[PDB]
Write a protein that binds this ligand. Structure first.
Ligand SMILES: Nc1nc2c(ncn2[C@@H]2O[C@H](COP(=O)(O)OP(=O)(O)OP(=O)(O)O)[C@@H](O)[C@H]2O)c(=O)[nH]1
Ligand SMILES: Nc1nc2c(ncn2[C@@H]2O[C@H](COP(=O)(O)OP(=O)(O)OP(=O)(O)O)[C@@H](O)[C@H]2O)c(=O)[nH]1
Lengths: 422, 423
């Protein structure tokens, strides 16, 4: 009855999802790893299967990396069912095209057999959630053939994705553009929605608000986990609006091809628990809609929103919420006068480690600045070498990159047009 | 027979129904669970229940939804074993705020089981009078299946009367950004297929809960208390022996002067109570006045400014006929009635009462101000449709721009027809 199959792909997918699963277990009263029913609450069935005296995360674990993801065997153990972990003969590098070549089909089918089992055990599929990085051979090199194959076999089932864009820093493999743009191509083309999380944003948040001297990758993952956990919460703990995954897709994406969403959450709390967390609704709303906390690094205080929704998690006064949200509506503005464009909902379960938390999602046209950065990497690469010179043997042909950039430009341009027309 | 079959479609439909059925049970002194009879049965339970040989009364109702949750929880937990278990019908995937799915997508297959099971239900009636459907307008299954079901009922049962009681998309409490699209598509279908319909606006309902009942922060569960009590008075005349309205067939004569202008607004009073003061204002004239005041009207329209096309006031309880009659003198003349419709205010009274009230009443008002409601929805429709927003969620299932345009035009013509009667 509307259950969700979760797909984790590549190193990023697994570390991030790991953090997610621990937190979601806590909220529903399931001990992590030894998944026993310690006073289980909420609509548990959406994300966990129940066998009896056990709760099994409904997850598919994918890693092209050779051998097995012991990183799960050792860190989570019995949290994940081993029959759901898929790997092949060898791994991949940081090149998207390797995920797409050298007999990757053996693992694509094995991944799909697992998916078929998580789907067939489920009475009804309410969607898929796919978490992956955009910068490497598995995160997107394999993750995008998954995204494509899923829509081919489950055409009416919405795919909501969370994806990580690499830091503009070039410390990573310099073939990143070739990955990033092919990744966007398939996300624009096949996903129903996606949350764009930019490591630059996570990084600057960690430096500036969470007081982290030199944020490590493992710290950034906690911001992500908190966003995933809270964003997903509206699907787990029934609140004042009857939302589900399919409905979220419909409310935030008015046009095809403009489905990239920003996300923000507050208070943002790391595992150190350095500060006491109590805020009023007014303070909390002003922060979640400020530029300071936007995970896409886009400054959506200067552009305009096309659709948006806010969930308050915890006990908050309705009077204060409405005044706080009135203040927000005067501080920014919304496009094509979608009269119904902004939604507010509430749900009483407190997210742990906080008195009151807030989730904000939005479709905002400043999101294209992420896409402008990716395009910029292409324009520099191709103004110097318009040859796809990293793809002269087993890579993609120019025509594939032609497709990819064409599609990316339509996204950028349509956002710009819709905003200016209103 | 003179039996009535109720359909409840979609979440709002099913939850409002569940409350209706609890209350109707109380009125007949029939127990909630197992539908037992507390010895002494009141009224005429045959209007809404079937009589089992074991004495069980089984409500003639179908709970229908695409999402297999609301059907399950009402039929197995909120009123366990009350509803006939074969009349609980559900799909496997919900719609998602999309008329198109409920009407043309999943739902178009399901409709064969819906209609076959209805056929089994009508076949149990000695003589069926009509169907009454309760549903959200702007939802997925509500709008979509509701309209699909309505079309099929009229084709299958052309001579029975089809009423609908439905909830309009106020922007104040909405689960769907596309709600206005679904609303104009649904309203179009209703104009072409129902014989009478009652329009409740959640905006108004919110205002009532907020200010008359004194309940801060209304949630859907509060709005549904107001709905359920209003709905209980509307069909009361079919449950107890009385004058005025005594059959769905009379409703269609007194309240619908034109075959295409059958949308009714409704009022209900006293809105239970404040839990202080008194259970009801007992002055007959205060009750009579209340039914024409803006605070008891679930449409959010001041009926003072406009033209009444029809009015029927059903009073319940201890009210004296002569006092009502005197009360009406200060109402006619405050309000205007159409020059082309000789009918004045019709009223009468059934000598029973909702549990806990000395007297109460409700009114069905056919009035030109209904157009304001349609015009708010149409304004939203127009801003969104003209930029193509969200149209891809409908075209993907087969509903193109031409159907949207058709629905828009028919609803606009309805609004224009009512506007002419203001002169
Ligand atoms: N925010 C975030 N970024 C990550 C995480 N893991 C890796 N990254 C970044 O993502 C990129 C690597 O993405 P992946 O596709 O998962 O790398 P991979 O393809 O699995 O690389 P191999 O393990 O060598 O096959 C690098 O730019 C890293 O900086 C993570 O858990 N969170
Ligand atoms: N008065 C009242 N209105 C409701 C209630 N529930 C929902 N609404 C309104 O109805 C709209 C949609 O209602 P739904 O009942 O969810 O329609 P649905 O068919 O269940 O929608 P799907 O779940 O997509 O099939 C909401 O946006 C509100 O405007 C309710 O319990 N009472």
């Amino acid at each position: 009855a509307g259950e969700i199959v979760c797909i984790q792909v590549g190193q990023a997918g697994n570390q991030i999802a790991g953090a997610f699963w621990q937190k979601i277990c806590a909220e529903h009263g399931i001990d992590p790893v030894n998944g026993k029913a310690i006073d289980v609450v909420g609509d548990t069935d959406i994300f966990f299967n129940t066998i009896g005296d056990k709760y099994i995360p409904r997850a598919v674990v994918v890693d092209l990396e050779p051998a097995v993801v012991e990183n799960i065997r050792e860190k989570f153990g019995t949290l994940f069912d081993p029959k759901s972990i898929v790997s092949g003969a060898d791994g991949a590098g940081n090149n998207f095209a390797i995920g797409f070549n050298e007999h990757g089909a053996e693992t694509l089918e094995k991944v799909m057999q697992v998916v078929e089992q998580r789907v067939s055990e489920t009475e009804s599929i309410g969607g898929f959630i796919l978490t992956h990085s955009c910068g490497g051979g598995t995160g997107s090199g394999f993750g995008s053939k998954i995204l494509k194959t899923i829509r081919e076999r489950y055409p009416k089932v919405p795919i909501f994705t969370f994806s990580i864009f690499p830091s503009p820093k070039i410390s990573e493999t310099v073939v990143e553009p070739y990955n990033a743009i092919m990744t966007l191509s398939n996300l624009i083309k096949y996903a129903s929605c996606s949350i764009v999380l930019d490591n630059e944003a996570l990084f600057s948040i960690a430096e500036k608000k969470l007081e982290v001297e030199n944020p490590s990758l493992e710290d950034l993952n906690l911001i992500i986990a908190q966003v995933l956990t809270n964003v997903t919460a509206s699907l787990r703990f029934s609140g004042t609006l009857n939302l589900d995954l399919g409905k979220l897709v419909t409310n935030l994406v008015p046009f095809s091809n403009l489905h990239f969403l920003m996300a923000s959450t507050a208070p943002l709390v790391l595992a150190g628990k350095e500060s006491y967390e109590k805020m009023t609704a007014k303070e909390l709303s002003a922060q979640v809609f400020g530029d300071e906390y936007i995970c896409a690094a886009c400054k959506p205080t200067t552009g305009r929103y096309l659709a948006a929704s806010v969930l308050f998690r915890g006990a908050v006064k309705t009077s204060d919420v409405n005044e706080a949200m009135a203040t927000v509506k005067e501080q920014n503005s919304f496009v094509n006068w979608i009269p119904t464009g902004f939604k507010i909902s509430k749900s009483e379960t407190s997210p742990k480690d906080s008195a009151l938390g807030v989730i904000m999602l939005g479709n905002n046209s400043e999101i294209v600045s992420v896409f402008e950065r990716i395009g910029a990497n292409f324009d520099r690469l191709w103004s110097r070498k318009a040859f796809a010179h990293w793809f002269t043997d087993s890579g993609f042909e120019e025509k594939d990159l032609d497709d990819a950039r064409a599609l990316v430009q339509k996204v950028i341009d349509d956002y710009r047009k819709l905003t200016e027309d209103a | 027979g003179r039996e009535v079959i109720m359909l409840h479609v979609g979440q709002a439909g099913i939850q409002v129904g569940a409350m209706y059925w609890k209350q109707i049970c109380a009125e007949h002194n029939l127990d909630h669970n197992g539908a037992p009879i507390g010895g002494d049965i009141k009224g005429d339970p045959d209007c809404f229940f079937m009589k089992a040989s074991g004495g069980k009364y089984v409500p003639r109702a179908l709970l229908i939804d695409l999402e297999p949750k609301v059907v399950r929880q009402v039929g197995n937990e909120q009123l366990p074993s009350f509803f006939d278990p074969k009349n609980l019908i559900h799909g496997l995937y919900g719609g998602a705020n999309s008329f198109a799915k409920g009407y043309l997508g999943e739902g178009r297959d399901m409709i064969d089981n819906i209609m076959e099971q209805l056929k089994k239900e009508v076949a149990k009636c000695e003589s069926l009078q009509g169907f009454i459907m309760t549903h959200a307008v702007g939802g997925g299954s509500g709008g979509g299946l509701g309209c699909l079901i309505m079309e099929k009922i009229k084709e299958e049962y052309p001579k029975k009367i089809l009423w609908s009681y439905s909830i309009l998309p106020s922007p104040l409490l909405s689960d769907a950004v596309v709600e206005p699209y679904n609303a104009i598509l649904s309203l179009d279908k209703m104009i072409q297929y129902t014989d009478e319909t009652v329009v409740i606006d959640n905006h108004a309902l919110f205002q009532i809960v907020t200010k008359n009942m004194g309940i801060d922060d209304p949630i859907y569960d509060d709005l549904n208390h107001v709905i359920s009590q209003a709905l209980s008075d509307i069909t009361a005349s079919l449950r107890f022996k009385g004058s005025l309205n005594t059959d769905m067939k009379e409703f269609l004569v007194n309240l619908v002067p034109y075959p295409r202008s059958h949308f009714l607004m409704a009022s209900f009073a006293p809105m239970a109570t404040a839990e202080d003061r008194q259970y009801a204002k007992l002055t007959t004239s205060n009750l009579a006045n209340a039914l024409f005041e803006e605070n008891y009207m679930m449409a959010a329209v001041d009926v003072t400014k406009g033209t009444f096309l029809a009015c029927s006031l059903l009073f319940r309880g201890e009210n004296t006929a002569q006092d009502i009659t005197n009360a009406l003198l200060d109402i006619k003349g405050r309000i205007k009635f159409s020059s082309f419709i000789p009918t004045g205010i019709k009223y009468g009274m059934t000598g029973t009462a909702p549990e806990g009230l000395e007297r109460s009443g409700s009114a069905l008002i056919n009035h030109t101000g209904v157009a304001e409601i349609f015009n708010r929805i149409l304004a939203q429709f127009n801003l969104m449709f003209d930029k193509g927003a969200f149209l891809n969620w409908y075209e993907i299932e087969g509903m193109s721009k031409d159907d949207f345009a058709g629905a828009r035009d028919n609803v606009q013509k309805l609004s224009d027809e009512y506007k002419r009667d203001e002169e």
